[PDB]
Each structure stands twice: as C-alpha cells, then as structure tokens.
C-alpha cells in the first residue's frame, strides 16, 4: 500500500529485497470497489444509525474461486 | 469502437457469473468513461464515451446502481452545456 | 512447504529525529507545509511534550501489530 | 516590461529558494499583467513566468489555478504561443510533480485539439508536447486513456512525418 | 498541572468550547460596539484559535469578526474585576 500511495507523489519506496512493482495489480481495483461499497453506508451509520451490512467482497471472491474450480481441471 | 462496445456488453453480461473479477474492472472503466466524458472536449470522443456509458448501464445494472447519483449528476452537467 | 525457521521481533527501536519547532536548513518548507506527524500536531502541545507524545503514539501504532516487544524510544 | 521582469527573474534566481517570501507580493500582479498584456510581450512574460515557476517549485500551488486559467484563456493556434505554453507546462510539472494531476484535466482539451489539428512544419509542436507528456510521469494514470489514442493515431498515420512518429514511439516507450 | 501550564500556549475552540465554534452569523452585537446612531455590528463568526498571552494572569487573545468585515480583537481577563475599569 505504501508503494501504491507514494507512486502518485513521485516517490518510490525501496526495500532491500527488490519487490516487483505492485501498483498496477488488478486487485487494487477490487480494494477501491470494496472501500467504496463499505464506506458508502457511513452517512446512514453515523446519522440515521442503520445496521452495518457486511461487505460482499469475500462472498464474491469465493464465488470466483468456485467458478475457477468448475473448469479448472487442467494445470493452468 | 464497435468491437469495444461489444466487449463491454459481454463483460457487463458476465458481471453476474464472476462479480469478483468483473465488478472492479467495470468500476475502473466507469471511472475512465466518466472522466473522458467530462474532460474530453471532442465531439467524437464524447459520443463514444456516452455510448459506452449506455452499454454499461444496460449490461451492468448491479455495478452502476450504487453509482447512480454520480453518473446522473455527470450526465446532467453534460446536458446543461452550451453535435447530435 | 515446511517452514525452515520462525523468527521473532523481540525488540523495537524508535529513533525520532523530529526536531520539533526547528526546520532543517536543507529544505525550506512552505508556510502551510506538512504538520501531521503520527497523527499529532507538534506545534499545538509544545516541542518537548509533542516529541514525547509522538514517540508514545508511534510505540502504540507498532504495538497494534506486534504488542509483545520491548520498545525503546530515542528522541533526538 | 522586459526590464522589470528580467530584473525580477534575476533577483529570484540569485536568491534561490528564499524567494518564496516574495510570492504573495509578485504573483497576483504578475498574473494580472499577463492578463492585461498585448502583443509580443505575452510570450516573453509566459517564458519568464515559467522560469519563476522553476525557481519557486512546490510553492506555486496557491497560484497554480490562476496560472492554469490564464493558460487556458490565452492558448491559441499560434505556433510561438503554443511552444511557449508547452515549455511552461514542462516547468510546471517538474515543479509540482504529484499535485499536477489536479490541474491536468483543465489543460487536457487543449492538448487533444493540438493532436487533432496541427499544421506546424514537421509537427514540431506535437513533438514538443510529446516531450511534455514524457515529463508528466505518474500524473497521467487517470488520463492515459485520454492522451494515448491521440499518440496512437500520431504514430499509426502513414502521412505523419517520420520524426513525429519516432517521437510518438519514444514517448510511449518512456511512459511504459 | 504546574508542569502542564507552560505548554498551554494556544487554545483551540474545538477542545475548549465547540459551541463557540458552532456560532455563525449571530445577531448578538460585538461587545463594546453598539451605538444608537451607527449600524449594529453583529458577530459573523469567532476565530477557532485563541493565542494565550504568557503572563501571570494568562489572558486570552480573542478576536471576533463583525458583519462589516473588520476584525475586533479583545483580551479575555480572568479573576480580576473590570467594573472599576468600566467606571474609569
């Protein structure tokens, strides 16, 4: 996360074991989507006081894992 | 551009089978389409952006439903601007 | 797949050369600049109190991940 | 005009990074002056403003919006003005860095128009704008989909000059 | 508290009294400013930060904003009678 955040400000964090860049990985898009879904209920949570509904992130990811398993017989 | 529209239509149709892999990418493409529409002052580019938005709406209602307010607000601001 | 060895971070050292209230000559910071250090504004609570409070806060932040460690803070 | 502006730029250069003190005194009058200027003084003023931005680096943020507004208002088809504004853009990006992405969308339409219609001999204006895009760096992540198709057409059009197509290829290679 | 006292250089309204930070466009007139002839200078807003003067009495430095746009700075004196100063 430090690498992804610092990239936008012309700064490249460095680690002694050189990690390949991870700012472009697709999972960060899922991170943004999950954050957007989770915090979109905050106005009602704070003001109205609704019941926090759990994010469907893990359910969707397990669904994707199931889809992969459905036809993942080959050593792909 | 037509191949692009067909690809987005298929991906939107697949938003239900593999949401974990489709929904984030569709969100990112929605981001790019919205900013393209808002910023690009080119008629053809805005035509393609709006057509993309329509395809995404038709094929990914679940994806766009939470973002109804921003998408509608951007469309309104475009509608109030001073090509058919 | 077996783990060859399990290492433990027994101790943590926090050297904080913050130099509260003094700007380093190398960089001339802007009038607003950046004032949040470990979510603490040093100028609000005085130099030495800010330095100690930031050190304690950073120790707490690290303890969030590794509570069981000997934390020793060096302040300037 | 030229005498006082040259003097101001020289004083700021000699002072170095201590010149940030005079920003509130200089910048508002400077921007109003560029606004009310006419003729060949405009390009010289933009050049000196770019030098001033280079000297000021990160401290030009409060006046950055006004500078962008001036550039949008005074951006035209004129080759000299286009070249000067492109150079000012390069100095602006090397001054700001990460914060430039905030003001990039304002200037994007002008770049798109420049790519669409450019009759400059050899498309040298396009090449210089390509160099500026190279200098943009990570600020282009949220607008790469906007800037890229112009460059793709630039190096895919056979009628375009070889130097311009080569510049487009180098720009894409750098952004990679 | 003796050790803590010197560190209290400035006071922010959000800690000491969020109600004053809430106050906006009050019809209440600026103190010592009402005149039957001149227009009423009502309080527009109160500045969020008060700069405490490092003195024995530690008087605050309050500054209000009037409806006319001109700042009015005042000193908040504690544990001292000001009726004598009013008569003077």
Burial class (CB in 10 A: 0-12, 13-18, 19+), E67: middle
CA C45 to chain CA centroid, Å, is 16
The residue assigned the tokens 């035509």 is: B47
Find out whether E80 is annotated in a ligand binding site. yes
- Rounded to whole angstroms, how far apart are CA atoms D144 and D130? 13
Task: Report how far apart the first and last C-alpha atoms of chain C are (Å, whole number).
Answer: 44
- Best residue in A10, A23, A32 for a mutation probing chain D (most D CBs within 10 Å): A10
DSSP A11: -
User: Residue D59: phi, psi to the nearest 5?
Assistant: -85, 5
Pick from B19, B66, B14: nearest CA to A57: B19
Distance CA E20, CA E13 (A): 7
d(CA B56, CA B71): 11
Strands E71-76, C11-16: parallel, antiparallel or unpaired by DSSP?
unpaired
Nearest CA in chain D to B41: D109
Give the integer Cα–Cα distance in Å for A25 and A56: 21
Residue C32, CA distances (Å) to C28, D62, D128 in order: 12, 11, 35
User: What's the longest Cα–Cα distance across chain D?
Assistant: 52
Residues in chain D: 176
Contact D116/B42, CB-based, under 8 Å? yes
Q: Please count the residues of chain B.
A: 84
Q: Do D58 and C30 touch (CB under 8 A)?
A: yes
**From which experimental method does this structure derive?**
cryo-EM
Q: From the CA of A40, how many Å to the nearest CA of chain B?
A: 9
Chain A residues 1-40 with a CB less than 8 Å from chain D? 7-11
- Contact of D121 with D85, CB cutoff 8 Å: no
For E42, the 3-state DSSP assignment is: strand
CA distance D138 to A8: 6
Distance CA B77, CA A48 (A): 30
Q: How far apart, in Å, are the Cα atoms of D81 and each of C62, D41, D127? A: 54, 11, 15
How many cross-chain Cβ pairs, A to B, lie less than 8 Å apart? 34
Q: Which residues are E65's β-sheet partners? A: E45, E71
CB within 8 Å of E76: residues ≥ 6 apart: E50, E59, E60, E61, E62
Residues of A within 8 A of D141 (CB-CB) are 8
Give strand ranges (E) for chain B.
none
Rounded Cα gap, residues A19 and A3, in angstroms: 10
**Strand C11-16 versus strand C70-75 pairing type:** parallel
Nearest to D167 by CA among D120, D134, D137, D136: D134
């Amino acid at each position: 996360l430090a690498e992804r955040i610092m990239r936008s400000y012309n700064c490249t964090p460095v680690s002694s074991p050189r990690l390949p860049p991870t700012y472009m990985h697709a999972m960060w898009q899922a991170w943004d989507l999950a954050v957007d879904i989770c915090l979109s209920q905050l106005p009602t949570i704070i003001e109205e006081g609704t019941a926090f509904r759990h994010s469907p992130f893990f359910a969707e990811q397990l669904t994707a894992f199931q889809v992969w398993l459905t036809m993942g017989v080959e050593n792909r | 551009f037509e191949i692009r529209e067909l690809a987005i239509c298929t991906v939107g149709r697949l938003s239900s089978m593999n949401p974990a892999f489709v929904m984030p990418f569709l969100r990112k493409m929605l981001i790019q389409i919205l900013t393209e529409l808002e910023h690009s002052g080119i008629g053809r580019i805005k035509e393609q952006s709006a057509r993309m938005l329509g395809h995404l709406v038709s094929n990914a209602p679940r994806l766009i439903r939470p973002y109804m307010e921003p998408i509608l607000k951007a469309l309104i601001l475009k509608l109030k601007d001073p090509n058919p | 797949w077996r783990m060859k060895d399990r290492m433990k971070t027994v101790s943590v050292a926090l050297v904080l050369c913050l130099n509260v209230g003094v700007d380093p000559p190398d960089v001339v910071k802007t009038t607003p600049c950046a004032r949040l250090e470990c979510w603490i504004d040093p100028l609000s609570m005085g130099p030495q109190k800010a330095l100690e409070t930031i050190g304690a806060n950073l120790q707490k932040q690290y303890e969030n991940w590794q509570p069981r460690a000997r934390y020793k803070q060096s302040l300037d | 005009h030229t005498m006082v502006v040259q003097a101001i730029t020289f004083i700021f250069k000699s002072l170095g990074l201590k010149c940030v003190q005079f920003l509130p005194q200089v910048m508002p009058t400077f921007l109003n002056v560029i606004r009310v200027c006419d003729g060949a003084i405009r390009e010289f003023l933009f050049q000196q403003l770019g030098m001033l931005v280079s000297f000021v680096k990160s401290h030009i943020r409060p006046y950055m919006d006004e500078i962008v507004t001036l550039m949008r208002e005074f951006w035209v088809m004129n080759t000299s003005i286009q070249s000067t504004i492109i150079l000012l853009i390069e100095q602006i990006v090397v001054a700001l860095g990460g914060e430039f992405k905030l003001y990039l969308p304002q200037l994007i339409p002008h770049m798109l128009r420049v790519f669409m219609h450019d009759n400059s001999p050899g498309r040298i204006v396009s090449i210089k704008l390509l160099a500026a895009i190279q200098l943009f760096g990570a600020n282009l992540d949220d607008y790469l989909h906007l800037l890229l198709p112009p460059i793709v057409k630039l190096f895919d059009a056979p009628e375009a000059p070889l130097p311009s197509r080569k510049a487009a290829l180098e720009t894409v290679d750098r952004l990679t | 508290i003796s050790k803590q006292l010197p560190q209290l250089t400035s006071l922010e309204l959000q800690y000491v009294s969020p109600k004053l930070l809430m106050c906006r466009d009050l019809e209440l007139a600026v103190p010592g400013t009402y005149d039957p002839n001149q227009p009423i200078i009502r309080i527009q807003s109160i500045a969020p930060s008060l700069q405490v003067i490092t003195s024995k009495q530690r008087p605050r430095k309050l500054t209000l904003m009037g409806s006319n746009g001109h700042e009015f700075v005042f000193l908040l004196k504690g544990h001292e009678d000001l009726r004598q100063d009013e008569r003077v």
